[PDB]
Structure 1
């Protein structure tokens, strides 16, 4: 408690989603970047659904959507290597939805 926030996330690859209910742990009241978070999303994709960097690079689309505590959503293209140079609070992420489509 008070050490980690548990951010729910889902992974869909090619329209198929496993029906577990999973959470990504972030240090509570910490700050992170889009590089940190993108790397976490890529590691989740590989470990849980075997999605490789090569599969992301060659996918039709590969995104993840952050739902923020203030209700706004932001889509991040996993195929891009450009990252805005800001920091955001770990407490401000409510949900992450990862969606990869190979075609």
Structure 2
């Protein structure tokens, strides 16, 4: 198991705590898997459900990889690239909903 740092910003507002989400390193993961993990903390920590995201103006997260690369994922999109990647390469995840 791997604990990935994440931050949540809702309507521009971010909080000062340090939080981590549990991600499996047992196999390579997809962005569909990561979406489910991101949506899990939006629901538990902010009361923002899957259907709430359908009505949000913007809902995204950015995966920062340890090599300095980044990927922006739109949580309102049902289009996925069918690739796998290692959870161990993730530096942090910045979650942003408006």
Both proteins in one fold, TM over 0.5:
yes
The separation in 2 between residues aligned to 1:67 and 1:30, in whole angstroms, is 19
RMSD of Structure 2 on Structure 1 (CA):
1.2
Whether 2:68 is the aligned partner of 1:81: answer no
Paired residues in the alignment total: 98
The separation in 1 between residues aligned to 2:84 and 2:25, in whole angstroms, is 14
Q: For the Cα contact (< 8 Å) 1:63–1:77, is it kept in 2? A: yes
Q: For the Cα contact (< 8 Å) 1:29–1:90, is it kept in 2? A: no
Cross-structure match for 2:37: 40
TM-score (norm 1): 0.88
Per the TM alignment, residue 90 of structure 1 is displaced from its structure 2 partner at its CA by 1.1
Q: For the Cα contact (< 8 Å) 1:29–1:91, is it kept in 2? A: no
More strand by proportion, 1 or 2?
1
Whether 2:16 is the aligned partner of 1:27: answer no
Per the TM alignment, residue 59 of structure 1 is displaced from its structure 2 partner at its CA by 1.1
- The runs of at least 4 aligned residues of structure 1 exceeding 6 Å deviation read none
Task: Identify unmatched segments of 5+ residues in structure 1.
Answer: none
The separation in 2 between residues aligned to 1:81 and 1:27, in whole angstroms, is 23
The separation in 2 between residues aligned to 1:92 and 1:24, in whole angstroms, is 15
Per the TM alignment, residue 6 of structure 1 is displaced from its structure 2 partner at its CA by 1.6
Moved more, 41-50 or 12-21: 12-21
Cross-structure match for 1:72: 69
